[PDB]
Structure formats: structure tokens, C-alpha cells
């Protein structure tokens, strides 16, 4: 009944496979491709990762809505509820936590505990200060939320791989999309 109960409930009728030894090294191999093809550029790789993320998030939102039938969200309470309590539950077997909203509650942050996209990577010295790793997630959280009629913008703040501070993602409502009704 609750959004915890549904997100845990889909794990009794979801086809599953191993989270190490596949799906970590897929992302690692494509980021190795982007690193070796741009001659170790550290910011264009974020752009191409965010592009491929936007495309996979726009293609993934339909499977999320068909897997559990839910009404269209409207604020950053229901999105902050639905994300952290079923979406990463049924796609990554994890659950992040929500903190650091503003006074008008027009933002929040997305502190993640066990990111399964980067398990024992330890990025080298030059990439440690000018590269973000998990930009496929920021692309997904742009492209998924842009198709439920909300413009959005989702950005990393810090992550464990280069920094002592945790893995978190900042996010702004950036207005609500207007559905276009008439003929003209």
C-alpha cells in the first residue's frame, strides 16, 4: 500500500541478475571508451555521458510508469518520496536519503549510500579534481523527470571516489511544464 511496500513488493516479480561482474564494468568500459577516444578529456566525457543518460532516462520513464501505475507528481515531496522509496529500489536495489532542502522546499539533495555504478574503481590523480563519474544517473534523473511534465536540472555536488564527503545530487524544480491542450 505504501510506497515502501510497493517498491519492495516489485522485487517478488522482477527478473534479476548479478550486480557485480555485469553492469558495473559495462559503465566502466564505456567510460574507458570515452576517456580513451577524447585523449583523456575530463569534461566532454561528462557531456556525452549526460547526453546518453538523457536518452536512457526518457526511454526508461515508460517502463517505470508501466511497472507501477502511479499518478503524476506535482511537488518535491512526492518526487522525493517516490524516487528514494521505489525507483532506486526497483532499478538498483538501493535507497538514498533526502536532506538539505531550502526554505521554499524548491530543492533537495540526494545522499546515496551504496552506489553500485562505482564499486572499487579508485580513479587516478588527474581525473580526481575535474571529472564526475556517475553522470549516467544525472542523465536519467533529467530525462525521466522531463517526461512527467516537469523541467528539472540535476547536478552532482561531491562523491566518495574523489572526496571525503558523500555521494549527493542537487536538484531544482525549475518550473512546472504546461500541457498544451488546443488546436491553434
Amino acid at each position: 500500500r505504501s510506497l515502501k511496500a510497493m517498491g519492495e513488493e516489485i522485487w517478488k516479480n522482477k527478473t534479476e541478475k548479478i550486480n557485480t561482474e555485469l553492469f558495473t564494468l559495462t559503465y566502466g568500459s564505456i567510460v574507458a571508451q570515452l576517456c580513451q577516444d577524447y585523449e583523456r578529456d575530463f569534461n566532454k566525457v561528462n557531456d556525452h555521458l549526460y547526453s546518453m543518460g538523457y536518452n536512457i532516462g526518457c526511454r526508461l520513464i515508460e517502463d517505470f510508469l508501466a511497472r507501477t501505475a502511479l499518478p503524476r507528481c506535482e511537488n518535491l515531496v512526492k518526487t522525493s518520496e517516490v524516487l528514494s522509496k521505489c525507483a532506486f529500489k526497483i532499478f538498483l536495489n538501493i535507497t538514498p536519503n533526502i536532506t538539505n532542502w531550502s526554505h521554499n522546499k524548491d530543492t533537495f539533495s540526494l545522499i546515496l549510500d551504496e552506489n553500485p555504478l562505482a564499486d572499487f574503481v579508485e580513479l587516478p590523480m588527474d581525473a580526481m579534481k575535474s571529472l564526475w563519474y556517475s553522470n549516467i544517473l544525472c542523465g536519467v534523473l533529467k530525462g525521466s523527470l522531463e517526461m512527467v511534465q516537469l523541467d528539472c536540472d540535476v547536478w552532482f555536488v561531491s562523491d566518495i571516489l574523489r572526496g571525503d564527503s558523500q555521494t549527493e545530487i542537487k536538484v531544482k524544480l525549475n518550473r512546472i511544464l504546461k500541457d498544451e491542450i488546443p488546436i491553434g
Binding site: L25, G28, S29, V31, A32, Q36, F120, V121, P124, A127
Partner: peptide
């Protein structure tokens, strides 16, 4: 096997 399966090393 965890060190040699680092993706970012050439």
C-alpha cells in the same frame, strides 16, 4: 583481480 579490473587504467 580487483586492481587489474580497474576500468580507467590504460
Amino acid at each position: 583481480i580487483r586492481v587489474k579490473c580497474n576500468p580507467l587504467l590504460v
